[PDB]
Design a protein around this ligand. Sequence first.
Ligand code: NA
Ligand code: NA
Lengths: 382, 382
Amino acid sequence: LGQQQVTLFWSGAITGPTSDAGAPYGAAVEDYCKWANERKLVPGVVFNCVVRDDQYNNANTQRFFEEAVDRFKIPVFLSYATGANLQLKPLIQELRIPTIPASMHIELIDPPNNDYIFLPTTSYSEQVVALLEYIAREKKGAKVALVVHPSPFGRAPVEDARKAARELGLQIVDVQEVGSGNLDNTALLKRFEQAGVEYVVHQNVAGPVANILKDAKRLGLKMRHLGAHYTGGPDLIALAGDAAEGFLWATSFYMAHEDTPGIRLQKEIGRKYGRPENFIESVNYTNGMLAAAIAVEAIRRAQERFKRITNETVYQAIVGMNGPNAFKPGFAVSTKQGVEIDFTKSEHTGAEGLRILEAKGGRFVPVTEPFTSALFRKVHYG
Amino acid sequence: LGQQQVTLFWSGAITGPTSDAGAPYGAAVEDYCKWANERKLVPGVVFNCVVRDDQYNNANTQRFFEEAVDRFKIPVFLSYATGANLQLKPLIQELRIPTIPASMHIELIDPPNNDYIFLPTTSYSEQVVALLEYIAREKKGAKVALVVHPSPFGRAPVEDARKAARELGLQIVDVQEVGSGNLDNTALLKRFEQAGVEYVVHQNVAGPVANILKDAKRLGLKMRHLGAHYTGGPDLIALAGDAAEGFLWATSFYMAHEDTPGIRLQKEIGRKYGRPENFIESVNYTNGMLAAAIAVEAIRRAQERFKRITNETVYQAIVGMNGPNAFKPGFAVSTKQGVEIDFTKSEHTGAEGLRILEAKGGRFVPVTEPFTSALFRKVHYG
Ligand code: NA
Ligand code: NA
């Protein structure tokens, strides 16, 4: 009765490892929550916006989550790191709070302790398998190398890739872990060239990838580079410049240059709060805005249906978010079959479609229609 | 329960332009704050820590500042951008609020509206002048170029530099402005070589400087590179690696590898709160902790002397911070006759000494004792 306070809490890497993505992501959550208040998107609710920088340290994330459950009574958890989410799964499950991660690791929505975790988009695995499919269409028996961030995040899609490579007749000849501060990748690239690698697939944030491309260009190599969600967009172009030309990127998001109410809104909100241009255009600002938008829309549905806002009512709002009752903010693509954001008790992936985009003269251009990977489902679910 | 709440407010670039510096700086403010609470530095008071990311946008900084005055009645301001500080001097003077900036621009403490602003360390102008002095004893009549950040921060020491150079018989042949995303610095460096530049002095953060060093190393160039406070430290090493070998750097801080209670405190505080290792060694983590330590010691002394914590009593505790009451936390160097941190109504610079250090084997090594530049006082004050 009257205005109530509701806490929207995100914990992730505004600084520290992976912060190329966590900074714009965190910023979008804070901004959207700010916009929810100004436009009164949820009648009778003022959002208390809590955005914590855990710097990719799982102990910081746990402490911030415990504080947020105990003190702020959160009905939802906007989370970040793969490693952190893996570690908190038992506790998330125990206290039944719906959790929407920036991490797209499929293991998060696999048993046990998976009833409350909802992936806004396709997983690292589907992305990587989608890219491998694209590789096998180009060139049979292609030699491919994986380069991966040194963490549970980098390692996430490695097993689905090996088994997909096997199914497609490709050979994964190496897998290397490369983190930030990779000033000189000469040795690694020379190793790949000796072994006849022809395609390098990346699972990383954009700074390590950019460094590798810069060196690749410098040395004049012919291997093609591809990458999953966090590797690309305008961020990669800004760090790699022309060394990005021809990079192939798998993602569920619309680009900054496409026409969508959601992309339009990201721009409007970004300018409103004076974000720098490169935040406004980041695909990760889009990514955070979708996560906060999902949370804010489930809170709204909870208010309309139950007139009470709890982990339980918010849960019920999310698992009813399907069919004609799906959420279509225009942030991510949809299959010509499907809708944009839809969940059920048994379907925990929001935007199940993705595309492959190619970097051309400084901009990522779609070279596919939205699609789902049946190959991913065979190798992963059997 | 029952404890007096004192708000410690900082606004700066946690992300956006200059964030290579602002992030560790803001992290140190927050941590020194948590630590004051853990240890109850000031009896009967709890510090509430408001650390805000303005992304180097002056409009955000001003809005954050006004809000913190209205809602928290802050007794001190920890500020950041040189540009934001220049714009706020009248309001700071109006509010009679001691302001301790990250910015070291000498013009902040020049009249008018300069009564409430205190530099913790040496200014940009004296660092640049000190460096030009190092150049003239090595090579009479040397050709030098200045490369600066494209903002008031970058341009801050240029007039003192021109003045000094002319006193020394050096020829400043070019001043260039380069910001972040300077991926290719070839055109600029080639223009330097054709102009016969033999020394490059940088006024900048670490990222752009690093990009220039790596290009210069690729091109086999032999100009010597030098830089003011924000250009160097373990952060420049991490970004530039070997290309930084030989860089000459002017700062007032102790190094991470030196032995000091203050440096010991920063490692202990940083590991206590799970900061990444690179933040913990950052000189800008040291720099922010000094700023926060001064703010906290002044509040402490105000409490003890006056039984009230206000903008007025904090100010009195700052201008009495001299002689027998000078402050010696051990973050910054002192001269032999001198002392670490001392202010008067008339002396608004804390640690007046600086050193020149040289990068050898990925570590900055002092190459001088602490000193002050008479030449700087000649050109700037007469
Ligand atoms: Na779905
Ligand atoms: Na002094």
